[PDB]
Design an enzyme around this catalytic site. Structure first.
Site, PDB file in Angstrom:
ATOM      1  N   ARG A  87       1.759   1.638   6.783  1.00 17.92           N
ATOM      2  CA  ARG A  87       1.364   1.443   8.419  1.00 17.92           C
ATOM      3  C   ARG A  87       1.718   0.154   8.712  1.00 17.92           C
ATOM      4  O   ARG A  87       1.617  -0.968   7.863  1.00 17.92           O
ATOM      5  CB  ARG A  87       0.002   1.986   8.531  1.00 17.92           C
ATOM      6  CG  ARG A  87      -1.030   1.289   8.021  1.00 17.92           C
ATOM      7  CD  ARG A  87      -1.985   0.577   8.985  1.00 17.92           C
ATOM      8  NE  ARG A  87      -1.695  -0.726   8.357  1.00 17.92           N
ATOM      9  CZ  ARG A  87      -2.099  -1.860   7.807  1.00 17.92           C
ATOM     10  NH1 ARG A  87      -3.335  -1.882   7.620  1.00 17.92           N
ATOM     11  NH2 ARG A  87      -1.186  -3.042   7.672  1.00 17.92           N
TER      12      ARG A  87
ATOM     13  N   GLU B   7      -7.337  -4.935  15.463  1.00 17.74           N
ATOM     14  CA  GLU B   7      -7.303  -5.381  14.113  1.00 17.74           C
ATOM     15  C   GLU B   7      -8.738  -5.820  14.012  1.00 17.74           C
ATOM     16  O   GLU B   7      -9.474  -6.464  14.807  1.00 17.74           O
ATOM     17  CB  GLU B   7      -6.312  -6.696  13.895  1.00 17.74           C
ATOM     18  CG  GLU B   7      -5.951  -6.511  12.652  1.00 17.74           C
ATOM     19  CD  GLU B   7      -4.761  -5.657  12.640  1.00 17.74           C
ATOM     20  OE1 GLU B   7      -5.114  -4.549  11.894  1.00 17.74           O
ATOM     21  OE2 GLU B   7      -3.608  -5.625  12.932  1.00 17.74           O
ATOM     22  N   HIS B   8      -9.404  -5.533  12.832  1.00 17.38           N
ATOM     23  CA  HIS B   8     -10.790  -5.849  12.509  1.00 17.38           C
ATOM     24  C   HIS B   8     -11.714  -4.951  13.294  1.00 17.38           C
ATOM     25  O   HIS B   8     -12.859  -5.624  13.599  1.00 17.38           O
ATOM     26  CB  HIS B   8     -11.032  -7.150  12.123  1.00 17.38           C
ATOM     27  CG  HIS B   8     -10.310  -7.878  11.060  1.00 17.38           C
ATOM     28  ND1 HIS B   8     -10.647  -7.695   9.740  1.00 17.38           N
ATOM     29  CD2 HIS B   8      -9.242  -8.359  10.880  1.00 17.38           C
ATOM     30  CE1 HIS B   8      -9.944  -8.251   8.794  1.00 17.38           C
ATOM     31  NE2 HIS B   8      -8.948  -8.913   9.465  1.00 17.38           N
TER      32      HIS B   8
ATOM     33  N   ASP C 155     -11.927  -1.330  12.960  1.00 14.77           N
ATOM     34  CA  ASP C 155     -12.253   0.122  12.395  1.00 14.77           C
ATOM     35  C   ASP C 155     -13.595  -0.155  11.671  1.00 14.77           C
ATOM     36  O   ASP C 155     -14.341   0.903  11.927  1.00 14.77           O
ATOM     37  CB  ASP C 155     -11.110   0.408  11.387  1.00 14.77           C
ATOM     38  CG  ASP C 155     -10.488  -0.227  10.229  1.00 14.77           C
ATOM     39  OD1 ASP C 155     -11.156  -1.478   9.974  1.00 14.77           O
ATOM     40  OD2 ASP C 155      -9.827   0.248   9.191  1.00 14.77           O
TER      41      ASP C 155
ATOM     42  N   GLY D 260       1.103  -5.087  -1.579  1.00 15.74           N
ATOM     43  CA  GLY D 260       0.293  -6.205  -1.230  1.00 15.74           C
ATOM     44  C   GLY D 260       0.839  -7.044  -0.024  1.00 15.74           C
ATOM     45  O   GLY D 260       0.130  -8.166  -0.021  1.00 15.74           O
TER      46      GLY D 260
ATOM     47  N   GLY E 110       0.635  -6.164   3.414  1.00 16.60           N
ATOM     48  CA  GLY E 110       0.042  -5.955   4.459  1.00 16.60           C
ATOM     49  C   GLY E 110       0.406  -4.710   5.331  1.00 16.60           C
ATOM     50  O   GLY E 110       0.128  -4.567   6.608  1.00 16.60           O
TER      51      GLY E 110
ATOM     52  N   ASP F 123      -6.293   2.764   7.579  1.00 16.11           N
ATOM     53  CA  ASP F 123      -4.715   2.816   6.612  1.00 16.11           C
ATOM     54  C   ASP F 123      -5.013   4.088   6.206  1.00 16.11           C
ATOM     55  O   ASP F 123      -3.962   4.896   6.125  1.00 16.11           O
ATOM     56  CB  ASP F 123      -4.905   1.777   5.531  1.00 16.11           C
ATOM     57  CG  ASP F 123      -5.008   0.380   6.358  1.00 16.11           C
ATOM     58  OD1 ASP F 123      -4.885   0.162   7.542  1.00 16.11           O
ATOM     59  OD2 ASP F 123      -5.334  -0.585   5.747  1.00 16.11           O
TER      60      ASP F 123
ATOM     61  N   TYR G 122     -12.186 -11.249   3.984  1.00 18.47           N
ATOM     62  CA  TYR G 122     -12.402  -9.866   4.466  1.00 18.47           C
ATOM     63  C   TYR G 122     -13.733  -9.527   4.375  1.00 18.47           C
ATOM     64  O   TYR G 122     -14.274  -9.209   5.376  1.00 18.47           O
ATOM     65  CB  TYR G 122     -11.473  -8.934   3.885  1.00 18.47           C
ATOM     66  CG  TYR G 122     -11.474  -7.530   4.432  1.00 18.47           C
ATOM     67  CD1 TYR G 122     -12.415  -6.591   4.218  1.00 18.47           C
ATOM     68  CD2 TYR G 122     -10.518  -7.128   5.539  1.00 18.47           C
ATOM     69  CE1 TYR G 122     -12.342  -5.122   4.515  1.00 18.47           C
ATOM     70  CE2 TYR G 122     -10.621  -5.878   6.150  1.00 18.47           C
ATOM     71  CZ  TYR G 122     -11.477  -4.802   5.701  1.00 18.47           C
ATOM     72  OH  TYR G 122     -11.591  -3.711   6.596  1.00 18.47           O
TER      73      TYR G 122
HETATM   74  O1  LIG Z   1      -2.785  -6.962  -6.365  1.00 19.50           O
HETATM   75  C1  LIG Z   1      -3.158  -6.617  -5.472  1.00 19.50           C
HETATM   76  C2  LIG Z   1      -3.711  -7.541  -4.020  1.00 19.50           C
HETATM   77  C3  LIG Z   1      -4.565  -6.555  -3.407  1.00 19.50           C
HETATM   78  C4  LIG Z   1      -3.389  -5.761  -2.635  1.00 19.50           C
HETATM   79  C5  LIG Z   1      -2.952  -4.796  -3.494  1.00 19.50           C
HETATM   80  C6  LIG Z   1      -2.508  -5.048  -5.040  1.00 19.50           C
HETATM   81  C7  LIG Z   1      -1.457  -4.650  -5.798  1.00 19.50           C
HETATM   82  C8  LIG Z   1      -2.130  -3.629  -7.071  1.00 19.50           C
HETATM   83  C9  LIG Z   1      -1.510  -4.166  -8.415  1.00 19.50           C
HETATM   84  C10 LIG Z   1      -0.178  -4.207  -8.693  1.00 19.50           C
HETATM   85  C11 LIG Z   1       0.572  -4.886  -7.301  1.00 19.50           C
HETATM   86  C12 LIG Z   1      -0.238  -5.395  -6.432  1.00 19.50           C
HETATM   87  N1  LIG Z   1      -1.042  -3.324  -5.345  1.00 19.50           N
HETATM   88  C13 LIG Z   1      -1.297  -2.834  -4.234  1.00 19.50           C
HETATM   89  N2  LIG Z   1      -0.886  -1.684  -3.680  1.00 19.50           N
HETATM   90  C14 LIG Z   1      -0.307  -0.627  -4.386  1.00 19.50           C
HETATM   91  N3  LIG Z   1       0.303  -0.747  -5.605  1.00 19.50           N
HETATM   92  C15 LIG Z   1       1.310   0.142  -5.958  1.00 19.50           C
HETATM   93  C16 LIG Z   1       2.096   0.370  -7.285  1.00 19.50           C
HETATM   94  C17 LIG Z   1       2.771   1.706  -7.232  1.00 19.50           C
HETATM   95  C18 LIG Z   1       2.981   2.351  -5.912  1.00 19.50           C
HETATM   96  C19 LIG Z   1       2.329   2.000  -4.611  1.00 19.50           C
HETATM   97  C20 LIG Z   1       1.512   0.865  -4.714  1.00 19.50           C
HETATM   98  O2  LIG Z   1       0.597   0.254  -3.904  1.00 19.50           O
HETATM   99  N4  LIG Z   1      -2.305  -3.596  -3.245  1.00 19.50           N
HETATM  100  O1  LIG Z   2      -7.249  -4.479  11.113  1.00 16.36           O
HETATM  101  C1  LIG Z   2      -7.952  -4.739   9.843  1.00 16.36           C
HETATM  102  C2  LIG Z   2      -7.788  -3.924   8.662  1.00 16.36           C
HETATM  103  O2  LIG Z   2      -7.306  -4.501   7.328  1.00 16.36           O
HETATM  104  C3  LIG Z   2      -6.759  -3.506   6.622  1.00 16.36           C
HETATM  105  O3  LIG Z   2      -6.024  -4.242   5.753  1.00 16.36           O
HETATM  106  C4  LIG Z   2      -8.088  -2.724   6.223  1.00 16.36           C
HETATM  107  O4  LIG Z   2      -7.663  -1.850   5.084  1.00 16.36           O
HETATM  108  C5  LIG Z   2      -8.291  -1.749   7.397  1.00 16.36           C
HETATM  109  O5  LIG Z   2      -9.645  -0.916   7.182  1.00 16.36           O
HETATM  110  C6  LIG Z   2      -8.907  -2.768   8.590  1.00 16.36           C
HETATM  111  O6  LIG Z   2     -10.047  -3.581   8.393  1.00 16.36           O
END
Ligand SMILES: O=C1CCCC2=C1C1(CCCCC1)N=C(Nc1nc3ccccc3o1)N2
Ligand SMILES: OC[C@H]1O[C@@H](O)[C@H](O)[C@@H](O)[C@H]1O
Length: 388
Positions: A36, A42-43, A45, A135, A137, A185, A235
Site C-alpha cells: 500500500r 498519516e498517523h 488510524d 521493510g 514503507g 495497512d 512509532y
Molecule cells: O526487519 C524488519 C523491520 C520491520 C519491518 C519488516 C521487517 C522484515 C521481516 C524479516 C525479514 C525482512 C525484514 N520483514 C517485513 N515484511 C515482510 N517480510 C517478508 C518476507 C517474505 C514475504 C513478504 C514479507 O514482508 N517487515
Molecule cells: O500512517 C501511519 C501508519 O504507519 C503504518 O506503517 C502503520 O502500520 C499504520 O497502522 C499507520 O499507523
C-alpha cells in the site's frame, strides 16, 4: 532507469516453479495481497481517524496445498528475508501455542495462524514470494499477513467480516512482530479495488471506494532506501503520547477532538503534547478535505494538502528524516509530494502528470543524495485467490 516494473505473472510463475521443486508436486491454490501507499492521512488510524490509501501492484503471493499431518511447511524466495529461507512447525493447540522468534518473516505467518478464528484448520505446504520491498514503507508485513489469512480461508472458510480479518492480521503484527500498528495497512490489503483509493473511517470502520481512474494523473512512489533506528523505537512513543493528549480533554480517541479545542486546551497538556495533536487533526481534516477534493477532481487542493501533510509530519509529528525531506524538495519542482507510511525512511508519494514521469525520474535520481527506486503505480486490487 531505476523503475521496478511489478511483473506479477512472473511472481506467480516464480512461486509455482519453486513449489514444484521444493515439495515434489504442483501447488493446489494461489493467493495474493497487496502492499500500500497512503496518499494522505498519516498517523491518524490509531487515533480513530481517517486515511486514504490505495493498493499497489507490489504484492505477496502464497502458493500451497493442504497437508494431512497437521504441520506447516514454509519456503520463502524473497531476497531480504532473514535466514533460514525455510521453517516447519506443528499447528497450535489448546496446550501448545506458536511463539515468535527466528526467522522474523515467519512470525507474520505464525501470528495469523495463531489468531485465525475458524476450525478445523489443516496443515499446509506453501511458498511465500513478494515484490513489496521488505521493510521499505509499503506494508510488506501487512501484505504477508493478509496473503496468509486469504490462504487459511481457502483451507477453512471463516464466516466473518472484513474488520474481524484485519483485526487478526493486526494482532499478529502486535503479538508476533511487536509492532503496535493501526488497522490501515491490513484494511487496504483486504479491501483495495483496481482504479480506486479507499477512504477508511477508523472510528466507524465505514469504507468508501473513491474512483482514481483519470489517466492524466499518476502516483510516483520513491523508495529512499533508508530505514533509521528511530522507526522501530519512536512509532509506539508517538502512539503513547497521542493517548496522553486525549487522557485529559476527556476524549476517548483524538477523532472526538476538534482543533478549536486543542488551541483552547494549550497548557492542559505538554508542548510535545500540543505538537503531534496539531498534526493529527491538521491531518484528519486534510484527509476529509482531500477525499472531497479527489471526488471533485480537484488535484491542486489535494496535492497542496499532501505538501501540507509532509510539512506537518516533518515539523509537528517529527517522523520525517532528511532523506524524505530531500526526495520531496526534488519532486516538488507534480501536484504534490510527502512521506507515506510510518516515516524514518521508506517511500515518498508524488502525484504527477503521466507526461512528466520520464523527467521526474531523471531529476529525482540526479538530485537525491541516496539510491532512489521508482514505482509508477496504478491503484490495485486487494486480496485475491486463483485455484490451480
Ligand atoms: O526487519 C524488519 C523491520 C520491520 C519491518 C519488516 C521487517 C522484515 C521481516 C524479516 C525479514 C525482512 C525484514 N520483514 C517485513 N515484511 C515482510 N517480510 C517478508 C518476507 C517474505 C514475504 C513478504 C514479507 O514482508 N517487515
Ligand atoms: O500512517 C501511519 C501508519 O504507519 C503504518 O506503517 C502503520 O502500520 C499504520 O497502522 C499507520 O499507523
Amino acid at each position: 532507469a531505476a523503475l521496478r516494473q511489478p511483473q506479477v505473472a512472473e511472481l506467480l510463475a516464480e512461486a509455482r516453479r519453486a513449489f514444484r521443486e521444493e515439495f515434489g508436486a504442483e501447488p493446489e491454490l494461489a493467493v495474493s495481497a497487496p502492499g500500500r501507499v497512503n496518499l494522505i492521512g498519516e498517523h491518524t488510524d490509531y487515533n480513530q481517524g481517517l486515511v486514504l490509501p490505495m493498493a499497489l501492484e507490489l504484492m505477496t503471493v502464497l502458493v500451497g496445498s493442504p497437508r494431512k499431518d497437521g504441520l506447516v511447511s514454509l519456503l520463502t524466495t524473497s531476497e531480504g528475508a532473514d535466514e533460514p529461507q525455510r521453517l516447519q512447525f506443528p499447528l497450535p493447540t489448546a496446550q501448545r501455542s506458536l511463539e515468535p522468534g527466528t526467522p522474523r518473516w515467519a512470525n507474520y505467518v505464525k501470528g495469523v495462524i495463531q489468531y485465525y478464528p475458524a476450525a478445523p484448520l489443516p496443515g499446509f505446504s506453501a511458498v511465500v514470494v513478494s515484490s513489496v520491498p521488505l521493510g521499505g514503507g509499503l506494508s510488506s508485513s501487512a501484505s504477508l499477513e493478509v496473503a496468509t489469512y486469504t490462504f487459511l480461508q481457502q483451507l477453512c472458510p471463516d464466516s466473518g467480516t472484513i474488520a474481524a480479518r484485519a483485526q487478526v492480521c493486526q494482532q499478529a503484527e502486535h503479538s508476533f512482530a511487536g509492532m503496535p500498528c493501526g488497522i490501515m495497512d491490513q484494511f487496504i490489503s483486504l479491501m483495495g479495488q483496481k482504479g480506486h483509493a479507499l477512504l477508511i473511517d477508523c472510528r466507524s470502520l465505514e469504507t468508501s471506494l473513491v474512483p482514481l481512474s483519470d489517466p492524466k494523473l499518476a502516483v510516483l512512489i520513491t523508495n529512499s532506501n533508508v530505514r533509521h533506528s528511530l522507526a522501530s523505537s519512536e512509532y509506539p512513543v508517538r502512539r503513547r503520547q497521542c493517548e496522553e493528549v486525549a487522557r485529559a480533554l476527556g476524549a476517548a480517541s483524538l477523532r472526538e477532538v476538534q482543533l478549536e479545542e486543542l488551541e483552547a486546551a494549550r497548557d492542559l497538556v505538554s508542548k510535545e503534547g500540543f505538537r503531534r495533536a496539531r498534526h493529527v487533526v491538521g491531518e484528519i481534516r486534510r484527509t476529509a478535505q482531500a477525499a472531497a477534493a479527489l471526488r471533485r477532481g480537484d488535484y491542486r487542493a489535494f496535492g497542496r494538502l499532501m505538501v501540507e501533510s509532509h510539512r506537518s509530519l516533518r515539523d509537528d509529528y517529527e517522523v520525517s528524516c532528511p532523506e524524505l525531506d530531500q526526495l520531496v524538495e526534488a519532486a516538488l519542482a507534480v501536484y504534490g509530494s510527502r512521506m507515506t507510511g510510518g516515516g524514518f525512511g521508506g517511500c515518498t508519494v508524488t502525484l504527477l502528470e503521466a507526461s512528466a514521469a520520464p523527467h521526474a525520474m531523471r531529476h529525482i535520481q540526479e538530485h537525491y543524495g541516496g539510491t532512489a527506486t521508482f514505482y509508477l503505480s496504478q491503484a490495485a486490487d486487494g486480496a485475491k485467490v486463483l485455484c490451480l
